[PDB]
Amino acid sequence: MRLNTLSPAEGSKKAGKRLGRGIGSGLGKTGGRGHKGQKSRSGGGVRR
Amino acid sequence: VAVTVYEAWRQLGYKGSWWWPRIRGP
Amino acid sequence: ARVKRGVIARARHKKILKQAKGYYGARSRVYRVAFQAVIKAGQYAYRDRRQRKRQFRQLWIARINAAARQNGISYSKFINGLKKASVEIDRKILADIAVFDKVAFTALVEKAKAALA
């Protein structure tokens, strides 16, 4: 019953990915896109 | 007196050289 | 909302440069070179932590061989005799005895020679 004593339910506030922030994060340096090609480009992809 | 001021000039270059034959030409 | 990287960067650079003391030239003054130097030093330390044991066992064996030949028998037959007599003293202690106690080592040689023959 204090403004610094409340807390959300567990398993409800997952963090969210952050690409390209070092080796230890597991997502630096191409952030999950693999190597060169059309799909690794900025704005790249194909129609539906 | 004893106070100094100056500026700069930066027109760089204007290439167009290598008047000799090509390195491994045709 | 806007965050400045002034203090954290200095802290990290000082942390790296502190453990590069004594290195020659730019390897102890400049961050780019010092970082590589520190990484390579870590790798070398990891490898030498294993090479140390091999080196010391080699030295012990050499000293024991010298003493045994002084008493009239080679290293191989000496430790074969010690195994046949069921003695469990290891090589570090044997080398220490050989250097620091000339009579106990002679007694051990006598026992091994008796067991072997």
Partner: protein, 110 residues
Amino acid sequence: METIAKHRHARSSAQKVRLVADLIRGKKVSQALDILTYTNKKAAVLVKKVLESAIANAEHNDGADIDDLKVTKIFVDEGPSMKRIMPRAKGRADRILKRTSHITVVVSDR
């Protein structure tokens, strides 16, 4: 007792002044003066003026008897630089540095 004189923003490169500086490091002042009198260098004049000023300071402010002084410390530092422009061939331009230096002399009866 320690006495100090300085010359700041002297118009000369520190590398050229350091050559004259070590000729007198550790000498008695009486022979240092005549050593500086017979060296054909521009920096010798500057160093001699600084040394004489230091001797006068030691004699007037603190105790007298310049007959027992020695040059204990002397060193040269680098001051600010002035930047200019020099034109080269084919329309290029280059940067020129005009370097200065600071001069410090310490004398001591001890």
